[PDB]
């Protein structure tokens with residue numbers, strides 16, 4: 001009955017969808033699905049971040065309006081979510097009116113808390129470095145020109161701007177990191193954030209005057225909101241903010257923001273400060289994943305390797321939170337061994353033995369031997385290990401525990417030699433076949449959030465009713481003898 005709210009970072013649709021976008025959607029989709037099967041009421045959100053000057057100039061470059069350009073490009077990110085079999089319950093675009101109103105509400109709420117003032121962004125700026133510097137990092141040379149520490153000229157620049165009093169929240173954020181050690185993860189991000197905040201926080205510019213493609217500042221519409229309040233507010237726009245009576249508002253606070261490593265500071269410093277200012281509770285965890293390197297277009301990978309092969313490799317091979325690598329032979333070999341061979345072929349060998357030798361019915365199992373109990377108890381244990389792993393977003397440890405059972409089951413099945421038992425002891429052959437099919441059922445229920453369509457097909461050839469596929473069914477709904485099984489077909493074909 002318990003509510004669970006999980007989000008992805010909204011993607012910037014200035015170019016095409018890339019692997020990093022698909023990686024974050026897949027990882028967050030698997031976490032969302034995991035909690036649904038674990039019995040939770042899940043709301044899972046993703047979307048697009050469409051405002052800004054770079055978007056306005058690209059619309060200018062193509063001869064169309066910014067809103068028109070946003071509609072065109074987000075359509076490909078909306079297509080990517082569908083191709084990846086994402087279970088997101090909503091899709092937020094910052095160009096939508098509900099976000100416009102949500103952003104203006106949270107802005108006013110921060111004005112009402114005393115945290116927003118109008119000022120100036122004046123300082124030394126190097127066009128060559130694209131960076132700002134304090135006066136002390138500079139020196140005027142024999143040129144008569146002033147130079148920054150990198151050896152390039154700096155110029156004095158001055159812009160009008162609204163600010164958020166970020167300096168007022170330095171101590172409250174450190175209190176947050178002390179009272180909730182799991183607020184920013186993994187541990188390396190946590191230490192980055194703590195060291196940054198502990199060194200002193202300056203007030204934060206949150207408005208621009210150089211473009212109208214954005215959300216107008218209430219009461220000064222020559223100014224528009226910068227990315228900070230715009231993008232981050234998407235998390236509460238999707239719940240109906242500012243209408244706190246919306247049925248969806250009970251989902252706040254978010255249980256988990258899944259983000260990339262590069263935007264850690266925006267979600268772990270700016271976002272909680274905005275919320276504290278606006279009198280709102282804080283999300284329970286922000287988790288940052290790493291970056292993927294080809295050691296490439298997401299649509300192409302899916303067509304070449306298959307969706308569930310790609311989902312598996314990305315979540316099994318990179319410890320979630322770290323940088324990782326992908327390559328053709330690695331995807332092929334890792335998916336051939338685990339999916340096509342270990343999982344897929346174990347099902348085919350065992351279940352076609354049931355079709356030919358047990359008349360297409362789940363055999364009636366006799367007494368369980370010591371080996372029978374070990375593989376069954378290991379399968380039950382993998383659920384508990386997977387649960388504890390997913391609580392920490394350790395997706396690879398969850399898949400590792402599940403596929404350690406698959407590998408042990410192959411050794412169990414080969415060690416029982418049920419083909420030899422067909423003549424010596426048909427009743428024993430049945431029990432071994434029952435054990436193997438029963439382990440496949442528990443594994444099949446458990447891999448549903450990581451490879452949903454493939455897991456669905458596996459549970460389909462085990463004749464598992466659609467209402468017996470929650471995680472609670474691992475322990476409570478074992479296969480019943482005498483049940484009719486459809487003719488088995490391979491679930492994981494080998495790569496060509």
Ligand SMILES: O=c1cc(NCCCNCc2cc(Cl)cc(Cl)c2)[nH]c2ccccc12
Pocket residue numbers: 008009010012049050051052053054214215225226227228230231232263266
């Ligand atoms: O200049 C802008 C650029 C922009 N998108 C750039 C890519 C966003 N970076 C990823 C990101 C994602 C999230 Cl969820 C939150 C933040 Cl703060 C940042 N978004 C903008 C929105 C309003 C006004 C200006 C901009």
